Amino acid sequence: MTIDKINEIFKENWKNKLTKYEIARIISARALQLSMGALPLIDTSNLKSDDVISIAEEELKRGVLPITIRRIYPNGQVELISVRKI
Amino acid sequence: KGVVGILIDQVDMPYTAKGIVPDIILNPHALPSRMTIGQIMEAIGGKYAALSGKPVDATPFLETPKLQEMQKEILKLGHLPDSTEVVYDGRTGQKLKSRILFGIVYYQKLHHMVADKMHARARGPVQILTRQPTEGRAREGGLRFGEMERDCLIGFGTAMLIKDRLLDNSDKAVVYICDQCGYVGWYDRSKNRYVC
Amino acid sequence: LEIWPSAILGIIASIIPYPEHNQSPRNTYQSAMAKQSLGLYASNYQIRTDTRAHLLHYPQMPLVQTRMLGVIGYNDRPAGANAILAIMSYTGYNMEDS
Amino acid sequence: STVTISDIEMLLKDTEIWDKLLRNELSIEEAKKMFDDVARSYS
Amino acid sequence: KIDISNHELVPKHEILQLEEAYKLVKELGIKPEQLPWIRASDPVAKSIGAKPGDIIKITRKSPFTGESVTYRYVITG
Amino acid sequence: RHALATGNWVGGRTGVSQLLDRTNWLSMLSHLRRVVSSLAPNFEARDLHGTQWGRMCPFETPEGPNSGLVKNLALLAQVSVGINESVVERVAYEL
Amino acid sequence: GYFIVNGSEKVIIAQEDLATNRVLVDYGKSGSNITHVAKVTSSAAGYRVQVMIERLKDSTIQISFATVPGRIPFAIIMRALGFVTDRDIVYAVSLDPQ
Amino acid sequence: VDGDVVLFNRQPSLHRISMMAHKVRVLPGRTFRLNLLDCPPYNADFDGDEMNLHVPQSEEAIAEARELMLVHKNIITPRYGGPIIGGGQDYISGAYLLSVKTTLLTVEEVATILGVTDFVGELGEPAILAPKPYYTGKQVISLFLPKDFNFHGPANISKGPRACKDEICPHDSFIVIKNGLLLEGVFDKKAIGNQQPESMLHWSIREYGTEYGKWLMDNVFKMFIRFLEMRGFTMTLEDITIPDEAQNEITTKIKEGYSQVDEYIRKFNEGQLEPIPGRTIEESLESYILDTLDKLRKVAGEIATKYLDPFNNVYIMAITGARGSELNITQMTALLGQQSVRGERIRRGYRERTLSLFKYGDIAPEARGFVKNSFMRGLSPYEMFFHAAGGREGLVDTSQSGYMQRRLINALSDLRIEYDGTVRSLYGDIVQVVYGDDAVHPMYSAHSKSVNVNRVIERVIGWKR
Amino acid sequence: MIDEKLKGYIDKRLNEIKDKIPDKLHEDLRAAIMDINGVELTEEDIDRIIDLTIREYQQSLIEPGEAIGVVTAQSVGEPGTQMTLLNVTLGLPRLIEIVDARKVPSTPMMTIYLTDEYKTDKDKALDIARRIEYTRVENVVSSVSVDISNMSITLQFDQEMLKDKGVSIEEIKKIITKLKLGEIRIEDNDEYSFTIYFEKIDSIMALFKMREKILNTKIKGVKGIKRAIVQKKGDEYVIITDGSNLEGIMNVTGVDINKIQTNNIHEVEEVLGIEAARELISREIKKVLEEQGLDVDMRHIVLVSDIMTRTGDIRQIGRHGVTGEKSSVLARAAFEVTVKHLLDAAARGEREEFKGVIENIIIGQPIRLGTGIVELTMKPNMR
Amino acid sequence: LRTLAQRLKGKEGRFRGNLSGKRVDFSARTVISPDPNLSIDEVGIPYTIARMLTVPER
Amino acid sequence: FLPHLGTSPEDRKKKGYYLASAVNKILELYLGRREPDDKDHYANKRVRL
Ligand SMILES: [Mg+2]
Ligand SMILES: [Zn+2]
Ligand SMILES: [Zn+2]
Numbered sequence A: 001m002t003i004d005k006i007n008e009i010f011k012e013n014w015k016n017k018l019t020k021y022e023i024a025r026i027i028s029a030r031a032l033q034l035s036m037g038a039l040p041l042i043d044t045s046n047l048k049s050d051d052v053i054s055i056a057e058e059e060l061k062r063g064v065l066p067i068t069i070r071r072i073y074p075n076g077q078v079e080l081i082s083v084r085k086i
Numbered sequence B: 001k002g003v004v005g006i007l008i009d010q011v012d013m014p015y016t017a018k019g020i021v022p023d024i025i026l027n028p029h030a031l032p033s034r035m036t037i038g039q040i041m042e043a044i045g046g047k048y049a050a051l052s053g054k055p056v057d058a059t060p061f062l063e064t065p066k067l068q069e070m071q072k073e074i075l076k077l078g079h080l081p082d083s084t085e086v087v088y089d090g091r092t093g094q095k096l097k098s099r100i101l102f103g104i105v106y107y108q109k110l111h112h113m114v115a116d117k118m119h120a121r122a123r124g125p126v127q128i129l130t131r132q133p134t135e136g137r138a139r140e141g142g143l144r145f146g147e148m149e150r151d152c153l154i155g156f157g158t159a160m161l162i163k164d165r166l167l168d169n170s171d172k173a174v175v176y177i178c179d180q181c182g183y184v185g186w187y188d189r190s191k192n193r194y195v196c
Numbered sequence C: 001l002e003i004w005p006s007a008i009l010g011i012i013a014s015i016i017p018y019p020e021h022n023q024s025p026r027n028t029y030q031s032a033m034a035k036q037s038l039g040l041y042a043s044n045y046q047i048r049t050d051t052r053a054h055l056l057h058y059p060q061m062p063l064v065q066t067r068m069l070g071v072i073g074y075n076d077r078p079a080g081a082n083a084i085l086a087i088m089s090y091t092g093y094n095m096e097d098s
Numbered sequence D: 001s002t003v004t005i006s007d008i009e010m011l012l013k014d015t016e017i018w019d020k021l022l023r024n025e026l027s028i029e030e031a032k033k034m035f036d037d038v039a040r041s042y043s
Numbered sequence E: 001k002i003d004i005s006n007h008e009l010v011p012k013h014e015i016l017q018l019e020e021a022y023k024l025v026k027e028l029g030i031k032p033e034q035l036p037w038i039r040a041s042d043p044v045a046k047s048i049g050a051k052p053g054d055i056i057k058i059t060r061k062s063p064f065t066g067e068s069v070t071y072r073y074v075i076t077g
Numbered sequence F: 001r002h003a004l005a006t007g008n009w010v011g012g013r014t015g016v017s018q019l020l021d022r023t024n025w026l027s028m029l030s031h032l033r034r035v036v037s038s039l040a041p042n043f044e045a046r047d048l049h050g051t052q053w054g055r056m057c058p059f060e061t062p063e064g065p066n067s068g069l070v071k072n073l074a075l076l077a078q079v080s081v082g083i084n085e086s087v088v089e090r091v092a093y094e095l
Numbered sequence G: 001g002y003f004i005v006n007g008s009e010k011v012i013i014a015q016e017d018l019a020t021n022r023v024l025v026d027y028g029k030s031g032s033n034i035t036h037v038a039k040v041t042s043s044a045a046g047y048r049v050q051v052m053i054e055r056l057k058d059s060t061i062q063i064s065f066a067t068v069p070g071r072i073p074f075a076i077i078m079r080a081l082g083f084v085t086d087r088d089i090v091y092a093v094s095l096d097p098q
Numbered sequence H: 001v002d003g004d005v006v007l008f009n010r011q012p013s014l015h016r017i018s019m020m021a022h023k024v025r026v027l028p029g030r031t032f033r034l035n036l037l038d039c040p041p042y043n044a045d046f047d048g049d050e051m052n053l054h055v056p057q058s059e060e061a062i063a064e065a066r067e068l069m070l071v072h073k074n075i076i077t078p079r080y081g082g083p084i085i086g087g088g089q090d091y092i093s094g095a096y097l098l099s100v101k102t103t104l105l106t107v108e109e110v111a112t113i114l115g116v117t118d119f120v121g122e123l124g125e126p127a128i129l130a131p132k133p134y135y136t137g138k139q140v141i142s143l144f145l146p147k148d149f150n151f152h153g154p155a156n157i158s159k160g161p162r163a164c165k166d167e168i169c170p171h172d173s174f175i176v177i178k179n180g181l182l183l184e185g186v187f188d189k190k191a192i193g194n195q196q197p198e199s200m201l202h203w204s205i206r207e208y209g210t211e212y213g214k215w216l217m218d219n220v221f222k223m224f225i226r227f228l229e230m231r232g233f234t235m236t237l238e239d240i241t242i243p244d245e246a247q248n249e250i251t252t253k254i255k256e257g258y259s260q261v262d263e264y265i266r267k268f269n270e271g272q273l274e275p276i277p278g279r280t281i282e283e284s285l286e287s288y289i290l291d292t293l294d295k296l297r298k299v300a301g302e303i304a305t306k307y308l309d310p311f312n313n314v315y316i317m318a319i320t321g322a323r324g325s326e327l328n329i330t331q332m333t334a335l336l337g338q339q340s341v342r343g344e345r346i347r348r349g350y351r352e353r354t355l356s357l358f359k360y361g362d363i364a365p366e367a368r369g370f371v372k373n374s375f376m377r378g379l380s381p382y383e384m385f386f387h388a389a390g391g392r393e394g395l396v397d398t399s400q401s402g403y404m405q406r407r408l409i410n411a412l413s414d415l416r417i418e419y420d421g422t423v424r425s426l427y428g429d430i431v432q433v434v435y436g437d438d439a440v441h442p443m444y445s446a447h448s449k450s451v452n453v454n455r456v457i458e459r460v461i462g463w464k465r
Numbered sequence I: 001m002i003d004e005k006l007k008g009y010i011d012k013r014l015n016e017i018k019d020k021i022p023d024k025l026h027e028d029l030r031a032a033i034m035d036i037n038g039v040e041l042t043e044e045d046i047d048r049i050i051d052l053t054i055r056e057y058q059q060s061l062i063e064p065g066e067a068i069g070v071v072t073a074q075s076v077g078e079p080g081t082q083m084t085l086l087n088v089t090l091g092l093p094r095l096i097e098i099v100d101a102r103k104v105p106s107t108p109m110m111t112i113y114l115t116d117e118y119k120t121d122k123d124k125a126l127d128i129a130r131r132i133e134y135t136r137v138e139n140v141v142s143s144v145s146v147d148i149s150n151m152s153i154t155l156q157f158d159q160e161m162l163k164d165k166g167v168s169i170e171e172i173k174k175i176i177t178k179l180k181l182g183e184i185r186i187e188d189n190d191e192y193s194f195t196i197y198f199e200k201i202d203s204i205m206a207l208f209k210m211r212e213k214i215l216n217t218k219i220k221g222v223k224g225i226k227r228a229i230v231q232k233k234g235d236e237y238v239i240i241t242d243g244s245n246l247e248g249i250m251n252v253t254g255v256d257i258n259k260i261q262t263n264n265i266h267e268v269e270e271v272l273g274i275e276a277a278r279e280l281i282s283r284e285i286k287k288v289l290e291e292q293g294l295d296v297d298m299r300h301i302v303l304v305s306d307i308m309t310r311t312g313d314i315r316q317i318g319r320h321g322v323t324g325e326k327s328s329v330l331a332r333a334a335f336e337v338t339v340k341h342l343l344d345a346a347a348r349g350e351r352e353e354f355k356g357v358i359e360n361i362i363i364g365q366p367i368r369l370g371t372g373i374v375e376l377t378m379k380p381n382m383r
Numbered sequence J: 001l002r003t004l005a006q007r008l009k010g011k012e013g014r015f016r017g018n019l020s021g022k023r024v025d026f027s028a029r030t031v032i033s034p035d036p037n038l039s040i041d042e043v044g045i046p047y048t049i050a051r052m053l054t055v056p057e058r
Numbered sequence K: 001f002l003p004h005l006g007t008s009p010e011d012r013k014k015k016g017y018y019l020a021s022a023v024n025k026i027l028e029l030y031l032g033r034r035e036p037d038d039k040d041h042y043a044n045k046r047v048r049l
Helices: A005-013 A020-034 A052-061 B037-052 B067-076 B147-156 B159-168 C024-033 C067-071 D003-022 D028-041 E018-028 E043-048 F002-006 F025-031 F085-094 G074-079 G086-093 H036-042 H059-068 H090-099 H107-114 H137-144 H200-208 H210-231 H244-269 H284-306 H313-319 H326-333 H381-390 H399-412 H453-461 I004-014 I023-033 I043-058 I068-077 I091-099 I122-132 I159-164 I169-177 I205-215 I246-250 I265-272 I274-290 I298-308 I329-335 I340-348 I358-363 J014-019 J047-052 K009-030
Strands: A067-072 A078-082 B024-026 B100-107 B119-121 B143-145 C081-087 E012-015 E037-039 E055-062 E066-075 F017-019 F034-037 F070-072 G003-005 G008-012 G014-018 G024-027 G034-043 G048-056 G061-065 H005-009 H019-026 H032-034 H050-054 H151-154 H174-177 H182-184 H415-417 H423-425 H430-432 I110-112 I141-147 I152-157 I186-190 I193-196 I218-220 I228-232 I237-241 I376-378 J022-024 J027-034 J042-045 K045-048
Touching: A020 A052, A020 A067, A020 H059, A020 I376, A052 H059, B037 B067, B037 B100, B037 C081, B119 J047, B143 H050, B143 J027, B147 B159, B147 H019, B147 H399, B147 I068, B159 H059, B159 J022, C024 H381, D003 D028, D003 E018, D028 E018, E012 E043, E018 E055, E043 I265, E055 I274, E066 I023, F002 F017, F002 G003, F002 G008, G024 K009, G034 K009, G048 K009, G061 G074, G061 K009, G074 G086, G074 K009, G086 K009, H005 H059, H019 H059, H019 J047, H032 H036, H032 H050, H090 H137, H090 H210, H090 H313, H107 H137, H107 H210, H137 H182, H137 H210, H151 H200, H200 H210, H244 H284, H284 H326, H313 H326, H399 I068, H399 I091, H399 I298, H399 I329, H415 I068, H430 I298, H453 I023, H453 I043, I004 I023, I004 I043, I023 I043, I068 I298, I091 I274, I110 I246, I122 I228, I122 I237, I141 I205, I152 I159, I152 I205, I169 I186, I169 I193, I169 I218, I246 I265, I265 I274, I274 I298, I329 I340, I329 I358, I329 J014, J014 J022, J042 J047
Parallel strands: B024 C081, E037 E066, F034 G014, H019 J042, H032 J027
Antiparallel strands: A067 A078, A067 I376, B100 C081, B119 J027, B143 J022, E012 E055, E055 E066, F017 G008, F034 F070, G003 G008, G014 K045, G024 G034, G034 G048, G048 G061, H005 H019, H005 H050, H032 J042, H050 J027, H151 H174, H174 H182, H415 H423, H423 H430, I110 I237, I141 I152, I152 I193, I186 I193, I228 I237
């Protein structure tokens, strides 16, 4: 119980889990930079759809993206989460 | 009142054992909560009027003929008195397990037609003052994205969607600011220099 | 003594068949919708110059009548047609006011 | 002075004491003593 | 005049020790005046003898957790 | 001509004259028998008064703000034209 | 029953309002100095003027019309119209002693 | 092209699901086509309504719209823990007619019903093998439930005497699901209807995901419509017509009520009527008359329900929760009852009488607005006048609501949930130390509950309980 | 029936999860598992139940970056458009009264509980209601006669009302004697009548003024209490009041001062404090929404109550409260379409810093809610 | 006349007419009709509207 | 004052009698011999054509 037990449960729950806003941000950034000329990190030969957003979704589902989320807590502590093969 | 949801060909319509096909199909769920018995009564009276060739008066409190006489005469002319029919599916040919009520009702077409109600705008002219899209279907148009839609977008948490709706597609512009006074300058385009 | 008990209505409420079997707000909505329907509005419409005008191609007079329809001349200038009506659930395209 | 001015000054003094304590320029006991002094002097 | 701390609408108020308040403000990453405020003339603040610069620990009744803890900062007025 | 063409009348009245509605036969017939109350307020002014029996139709009213304030004449009702008060006064005094 | 003005067909809509030259009485607003109110809207050939009559908690009747800012007592305004004695005013109001 | 993401909106935009992301499908016509299950979130209708469309133009905007605003991700509303998307009118009655225990189907009928879905596979053996091979509607419904789903609960049709409150019910009023097999009960408004928290559909969505809810709504809800098409569902005029003995009983009850009202009036005239506290005499007499007439209407409705067929289509539409109530059936079949204006009988009219047809000072039930006929039998001229007078004040039926919502939005727009779990303003001020009390989103709640422990117990050991 | 072995297994297996969920949820889970009867229960069943409970709680947590203020505002204001209506104020006008922080309600009301010795007696409750209700002279007078001949006012008293209020003619005479009228003279005309003779007054205007001065004189009762009603809830008798006076009623004998209720939030704030005030605010909003059949989760209401009591005082959400305390000039000028805010800012040389969401949308820059709280880093070399 | 301060206040002024809300491009409005054959994620679009509104694809 | 009764000095007694009748009506309302006039009664409404 740092401040309250509920806050500790909250921070323990979100320790190794991505929020929907982080997923949306990662997918949008990957799609934007993939439409600008980047090379896909997956096969992209037998995918159902060949648009950038679908490829970004598939690249996020199987961890190949070298992207890191930086969480800044209000007291200044920093947490880093990697989506590259977790 | 209602709007047309689909138009179905005569082959796909359900038909009676005489081959009669409805012009309009009404949902049974619209009647019980609105309690318009006069419409079912009018359907029965219209079927009677078409079968018998006799006048039907539906003046309030003084209706002639009465409903029971109408139903007896409908039975004597070769139809079921309760105004129901044996019906087959036009797509498969199989008889429905229930009898369906057929009748004749007077319908009216209102001047609210979708051919005069749809308008879209991709790009077009802008205001001379605000440099924002115009207004009205007479001009190229433009729908207003008000404060409540902005609140919906904020509630969903979509920053780039908010930007796309409210800046990129309405009045995006570029200005030049002096770093000492914060006033708006300009580009001279002839001497290739910034002037504040 | 009353001359005509149905003379408590107006000219548009006088076109409703069996109005005493309906709920009153529906009788009120009918009067609003009856002024927006398309038919024949004048016999000399082709030589007039109206800003906006409509014309139903094949108008019919109602089979279920009221005594006031012939008095006001509506059977000569009708604004509708008689449809074969079925009351059933079919394909789900007539749900909730369709 | 006036009640409002005394309230404003005591709020300012509490703010300064908290700022100095949070910067590790004071100990807990010294902060307690100063808080008590201000509270008693402005009661 | 009258004791009101026993009313059913009044939650429990407690003055917080300086070390505990210091730890709380450090672990929240805030200044003391960024908490919700309570006046020194509040009827329940006077009942416990709270002076400005203190932090009050309040325990309220909750339908989701049973008991809920809240903190207020004592101001002048 | 201006009074008939704009609808703004003498005495503060507005909307006295309107363009005749010719959408169909019933539209024109109903427009020629419309009565508008100058209030168009109180919830008691929108009530169906028992004195309206045989004079105004109980069903033909708009929906919304103008409900109960715009009415339509009943079938057999007329509006009085009036006579000189002096004749009736002389008859009453002689009576 | 309509007019053709500049080629357009114009209908005059009937206007419903209160009777003009009659007295209508009502109670005053609750918790006010006025207990009872009477109103007259006298209409001339070209203009109409409203006359208001109040009764206060003092059991006094006050007259108030358009072109005078204040309230005039009933007997004062009655004396200006040729009713000089109190008996004339009293018997002009009513014959009932109560 | 098909599959593009757009924003679809209906005004006024009161909550955030007034505008959601949709996938484009291009079809012939000049109209915006919308699924019938999507209407409750928009408060939409097909009376001539219009809606707006918006096409995002950038990659980031499209990605955000597809990730956060898609329709099936927003089945549960944030106002309370319940589904805002669900079945309507034909869906409920079709589900009831299909899931009732008397429905038997052949192989061809089963193939016709399942042809509107995505189902391909083995049907299993028919429920009945001899004398003829027959499938059951419950058996066909069970093909779409997960093979570990358990549910026990009452049906909507269990309002009346058919309620048994246990698994032994001969009326299909109690729903029993064990290991994804519908063994008892029917499907109606309380199992698949929209805006019903803690229903079977709600538990399915909560415990299997919103993608499962999307798959279920797109497959099983079409079967209900197809079965209505095969069975035939109509409304005739004999569904609301009662025999002569029912009318005679209603007439005798009306006579008894009128006698009671006359006795009240006589007691008032002789000065032997006691008042109710806080009200004068001649105001208590009105209350007594209104009570007597209300009881008369209730009794007449009960008689009319007793002497009507409990399996006609109007009764089916009423008991299952599709359309209509019992008051509608009573008014259409027994009597309208007393008409009122602002809680009082109809009085405004001439002096001491509403209409010139009545005597001076007559306060009998018919003189002041009691209708003893039904819509089926027709109203009298003065009964029609009274009915039109009673419903006048519903015709009058927003700036205050808009102003209040605007003030709330401008007061609260800057609050955010932090990684700490704290609610803070964008200027740093702390509002709540932890959101709510347990940091549980109302959208993910089990109808305001973080966890329903009884539901967990039913999930684990429901197949043997 | 759970045997002792399985109960011990349950207790052992429940003690290793005490830190994984809230205490109330743990208590509810323990109470629910012990009530399973008619089913032969197994250790694997207990394991599955506990694991599913923990997982279900973890799956319901709110996510950081959520714009919870907008969601709360939309969840509270949206049902406000669906509201379709002593006669206390209710619905949308009452909700507006609550959120606008009105000093006094349109229809004040109190609920007064009594002590144990006054709790179950009807006569004692009636006596309390009698002695707390505010009564004037005109509330017991049946007829008033004004005499012009001798400048005398005659008062006739209703015996039934005089008994009901517990008032006697002697104390009425004593109260009238204390008035400012002057040199008067009272004479009995009957057992329920007397006349004030005014041996001094001259005109009729002053006679009438004296008459309405007499008829408005207070006899008894606590100020502000217009009507008191005795109600039987269970075996207890409760007093329902048409007015509001917390200070006055708290001094009345037999009143339970730890259970007294009011709908006046400002009196409750002044007497009991701000936490009681915000609890009352939440209760009032919840009751107003619930009595109309509208389902709104309590967390939104609690957040609203917290936002309206943050500064130690009750503030309205509008111009003179929470919205007007915002530190953005442009947001205030947009909410209040007036331009005087910009003139004040120019006069005082204020500085606007673009921290909120509305101003950033006005100028056209991304907001810090939702996807704006996320910040990303990448390693491009990893192909 | 309409002056400097009149261009800023009101519901049609600068703030609430052009800053808080505005008219936008790539938008359409039409009557709605039912379709039980669509998914809950889908919306039916006319051919005319599909050919006028466009999506820019790199 | 009361233009519908005349605009000449000779027409003052008529105005006095009219005002006396109005005062009589309001006094009758005071003593409970009357009720407030119904403004929705069609005896009080006129239609201008
Ligand atoms: Mg609609
Ligand atoms: Zn410069
Ligand atoms: Zn049963």
